[PDB]
Structures are given as C-alpha cells and as structure tokens.
Amino acid sequence: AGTSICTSEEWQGLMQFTLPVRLCKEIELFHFDIGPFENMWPGIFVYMVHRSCGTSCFELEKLCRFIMSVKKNYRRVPYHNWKHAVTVAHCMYAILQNNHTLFTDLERKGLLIACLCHDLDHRGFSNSYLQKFDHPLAALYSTSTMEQHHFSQTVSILQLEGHNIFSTLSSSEYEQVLEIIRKAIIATDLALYFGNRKQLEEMYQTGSLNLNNQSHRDRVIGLMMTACDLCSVTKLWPVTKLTANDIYAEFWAEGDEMKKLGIQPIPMMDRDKKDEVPQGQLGFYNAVAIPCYTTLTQILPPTEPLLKACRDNLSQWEKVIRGEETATWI
Ligand SMILES: O=[N+]([O-])c1ccc2[nH]ncc2c1
Ligand code: NI
Ligand code: NI
C-alpha cells in the first residue's frame, strides 16, 4: 500500500558519496558488473547521470532523494529488484556514452531515469500470472500490465515532495521527457519486443531507417531498452550463470502458485523441471537475446561487444547441454 519515501539520512549520505577512483575506468565498459559493489550502487547511478548529463542537469538534493526513494520502492524479490535496476541503468549508460551525440540531452536524462525505474514495485510475478488470475492490475492495465504499473510508480515518486528532478524543464520539455520515459518503460514488455525487432530489422535492411523520424527514434530506443533489460546475458559467464539462478528462483516461486490454483505451470516455472533449464536458455538466446543484440549492433555499431558477449554465453549454454559444464558456485 502506497509509495515509500527514503529517510533524510539516506539521501544526505548519497550526497556525500564519492566514486572510488579505480572504478571510473571500469564503469565505462559494457562488461562491467556492479555485483561486487553493493554499498556503491546509488553512487554509481549519480556518477553515470553526472557523466552523461552533467553535474548541473538535476538539482543534487532532489536527485539523491529521488534515487533513494526509487531504491526503497523495489521489493526484496530474487531478480526484479534494486540490483537489476542499477545493472540495466549501467548498460544504458554504456550504450549512451558510445553513441552520445545520436541522443538529445533530454533523451539521455529520460533514459537513464527510465532504466532505474523500469521495474519499480515488481512483485515477482509475470504478466501471464496477473492476467490468468485476474489480479486488479490486469483490469486496470489490459496489456503490458506490469510495465504500465512501473510507469505509474515512477510518476508517483516524482510527485513526492522534493523529488521532482524534472521540474526545472520548460513545460514542453517536461511533457516530452515523461513521454520518453513512458514509451521506454512500456518497451521493456518483451511481448512488444518481437514486433519491434522485426520492424527495425526491415527498416534497417531496406534502408528506410531514419533517426530524424520520431517513430523510428521511439523504436530504436525501445530496442535499447530490451538490450539493457536483458544485459545479464552480456556479462562474463560466471556472472550470467549466477544471475540466471536469481531469475529462476523468481520463476519457480510463481510456478508454485499456479499449482495451488490447479494449473500446471510452464516447465520454465516448474521447480521440478530444472533439467529443462539449459534447453530453455538455448531457446531464449536463439529467439530473443541473439536477434536483439544482432539488430542493435547493425543500428548502433559501437554496441558490438554486447553481441559478442551474448554469443559467448550462448556457446556456454551449448557446453552445458553437451555435459561439458565445469565447477559452478551459487
Ligand atoms: O520473459 N522473461 O521474463 C524472461 C527473462 C529472462 C529470461 N531468461 N530465460 C528466459 C527468460 C524469460
Ligand atoms: Ni519488467
Ligand atoms: Ni527488467
């Protein structure tokens, strides 16, 4: 019930944070894993906003309140949590730094914020679940159910006293950035991804893709959102493999609920079907991750290291299937 708000101690502490100097170099690389630096995550986000958008872009106190309240509105679920938020924001930073002048100041600020907020108040349940069992959210939001909710949660946090980091935009730019954020969050609905990628592939291959065309820009930003949302698959193998453990902890807890309601879950959500996980991952990389990074690399060549890493992880899942797996810790 309701929107959580950070404490005075929380945001003032973030204000004083300084990013250890060794990390400045690493944070620029696509493969950077925030995993080992949990105390630093909010500070890492501040640093990225300041590098991409400038130290003056947002009033610092409002930005620190906003970030710490966002953190407090992610739930203690295994995967769709604060760590995932910051990981996705970092991928977006790396894409923006590598393609900086393709995007406007307003787009960079909107997209970094959109990434941090994109899974706000996730409960650990899929759109499939909310709609199968008529959760009130599915009645309010007939499609892209959770994504519409995440955007509503974002607006709710902006509306908290002292939290509106966008208030200094002109009335026009304010409307525009909220629309950038809305479209970007909605785009994280993987249901929309398949259509988006196919459209972009066609536009690219025929030569009609045009970044001065707003609808084209929206679609490219959409695919950037997918690429960032799934970026666990572009990390080093042990990081990818550990993250998969968290994703599945979430899926299996959902499957357990569907069994109580008399429906056998899809195998992916069935904790009694872990043997199917490697082939499930192969299917996901072939159907979703590989095509995504493939298209993103055609459109934004500097993003190629994401595709190379995704291919390397596809190879690792193939190794698992062939029984070649070596020692893993979890
Ligand atoms: O759609 N998803 O939520 C989702 C996300 C990541 C995934 N990895 N493997 C399957 C899979 C499904
Ligand atoms: Ni999501
Ligand atoms: Ni997500």
What secondary-structure arrangement, pairings included, does this model have?
Blueprint: H1 8-16, H2 21-27, H3 41-53, H4 60-72, H5 82-98, H6 105-117, H7 127-132, H8 136-140, H9 145-158, H10 171-187, H11 190-206, H12 214-229, H13 237-260, H14 277-299, H15 304-321
Helix pairs in contact: 1-4, 3-5, 3-6, 5-6, 5-12, 6-10, 9-10, 10-12, 11-12, 11-14, 12-14, 14-15
Bound molecules: 5-nitroindazole (5NI) and nickel (II) ion (NI) (2 copies).
PDB class: hydrolase/hydrolase inhibitor
Keywords: fragment screening, hydrolase, HYDROLASE-HYDROLASE INHIBITOR complex
Assembly: monomeric
Descriptive overview:
The two termini are 33 Å apart. 64% of the residues lie in helices and 0% in strands. 36% of the residues are buried. α6 packs across α10. It has 330 residues and is mainly alpha-helical. The protein is globular. The chain has 15 helices and no strands. The PDB classes it as hydrolase/hydrolase inhibitor. The entry lists the keywords fragment screening, hydrolase, HYDROLASE-HYDROLASE INHIBITOR complex. The assembly is monomeric. Crystal structure of PDE10A2 with fragment ZT448.
